[PDB]
């Protein structure tokens, strides 16, 4: 007996197109999404060129419309040069992404004043998400308060960070957050197996105490999101390993395993992969869209999942229970048992749907 | 310039059919809903007969399917006799309603042990809501913890109650709550004008300090819901005034006025009248459904709104800014400028839609 889930939403994926298409492209990354039970993705702007301007957004929109197999929204990225310039296109994006720690010269911000300027100029009704680790979480929360608006913290990975966010929520501050599966299911204990290259990720893997703190504070976590960050094995194992793990194909099986073990409920999962992504990002419903999962099937994660061009996974060897059997997207069979059945270009930009605009005062 | 809102959801209405149709019926109450920008309602079970059994639910379902003009779900009511008997029909209801303070002999529970029995027997994945005032909020929260599940607190009306709920959320407990407009926009200061009969409501009107505490703790409030509780003027002004206010037609204009004053944001409103109702009750999206409001139009609430059969309102004389201009429900014009344009029976039971079942493990 299968369980029918709604179309799940991953608000944090790196699909690498334009400019990194040996790692992933819209077609391969959205195949990976569908195979993971994900019907809508929000794609990050650290591509080449980075999505930091209207022309780059226009290019990425067309590449996504032509290549995506599931529905999507595209983030804009904050730069040291673009505050006050994005107003015309801001509503067409998933939101604005701030990279507040290590990143590419183009998304690097030199000063908290630049964070301020983005919070002051980006339309106040539209989402802002931040890569903000350790004290940076507190710093960006201060900027959000000074500018009297909300912020969403990406991939919370540490006891320190979840407890800070917990304290902020207890004070009534408008902050939400997400957690990625590697920070719930991997830790320092796995670095020996992974090695120092494969194990490179930002935020880094936490201690067992970090992992246990995230589980104990599940009530504080608004969303799960993969931070699908594909790189090839050659890159991960080479001289200057880039940080990041592929994760679209493994996120739901890992979480279903936890549900079957009673570590969280089905509802907890659906708040975090459906309802809360919708409401934080004002993402529209997908008509006639659902995911059928088999909760009894036990399997072991292999050395690579079928669809991501990363062609490796840090979860290799973990035993999971639960698997995606079928995905229907807007009335068409999109995935069955290891085969994607919608072509590149089937997916659509949800921000162009009438129901997909973020409401605002006139 | 109008603002387009999604279809708003009121999770707490009393539509009085069967058995109280001089006060309201499905057709009149759902006309009131549409005129208030509400496209989906959850109807309470304290009708005559009360919806405390499968035969009464079946009757109410058919009456609603024939009379409702907007979409709906129907609550079941907990009684002193029905714990352990509702399993077959539970998934067809909005949820289970517990009346834990003053009510009708038929929904009255005599002992906290009966609350326990309901929490133990009602399917654990399905919603439970409680009318629980003052210490009863703490009591029902204890029962929810003992039985390891969530609870939703109806119409929070007091500083005491919102602070208790705040403390419970700070401890990570699975509790949500709603607030009704009369507890945000009326207080003891209005009892002289209303008089003791019209002013009768449960929970009672609070002090100015209660009202200010609810506003200050807006972050703790998950939903707004009207507790639309129509009674005729003859009843409200007579010897034994029943408690309750009509509220469907005034809720959104009152809240839009507060938005225009900067007391909360448009997003805050849409979380509380759309996204959070959806996610707490697992209510499905409504396709091709939206509400257009005019935020500039200033008017004064009259002595009665056009649609509710209550034919009175406690908000008479309040100045508001914002009004519903048009509602489209599932592709049909349902309301324009004072005229409802869908007939009785247009509305549907959302729990019968494929997307409207609450997900559960097999
Ligand atoms: O911040 C980031 C971005 C990401 C990528 O490779 O794009 N991978 C990571 O591990 N951290
Ligand atoms: O608990 C309730 C129920 C309601 C009604 O009249 O049905 N009206 C109220 O004021 N309190
Ligand atoms: Zn990041
Ligand atoms: Zn993120
Ligand atoms: Zn990322
Ligand atoms: Zn929204
Ligand atoms: Zn009540
Ligand atoms: Zn209620
Ligand atoms: Zn009520
Ligand atoms: Zn749901």
UniProtKB/Swiss-Prot annotation, chains A, B:
Q: What is the effect of changing residue 14 to A?
A: No zinc-binding and no catalytic activity
The observed outcome of changing residue 131 to A is: Abolishes dihydroorotase activity
Result, substituting residue 103 to A: Abolishes dihydroorotase activity
Impact noted for substituting residue 131 to N: No catalytic activity
In which residues is Zn(2+) 1 bound?
A: 12, 14, 97, 227
| Post-translational modification (record) | Activated by MAP kinase (Erk1/2) phosphorylation just prior to the S phase of the cell cycle, when the demand for pyrimidine nucleotides is greatest, and down-regulated as the cells emerge from S phase by protein kinase A (PKA) phosphorylation.
Binding locations of (S)-dihydroorotate: 16, 46, 202, 231, 243
Annotated residues that bind Zn(2+) 3 are located at: 97, 131, 155
The reported result of mutating residue 178 to T is: Abolishes dihydroorotase activity
Give the linked disease. Answer: Developmental and epileptic encephalopathy 50: A form of epileptic encephalopathy, a heterogeneous group of severe early-onset epilepsies characterized by refractory seizures, neurodevelopmental impairment, and poor prognosis. Development is normal prior to seizure onset, after which cognitive and motor delays become apparent. DEE50 is an autosomal recessive, progressive disease with onset in infancy and favorable response to treatment with oral uridine.
- Family per UniProt? In the N-terminal section; belongs to the CarA family. In the 2nd section; belongs to the CarB family.
Name of the protein in its database record? Multifunctional protein CAD
Protein's organism: Homo sapiens
Which stretch of the full-length chain is present here?
1460 to 1821 of 2225
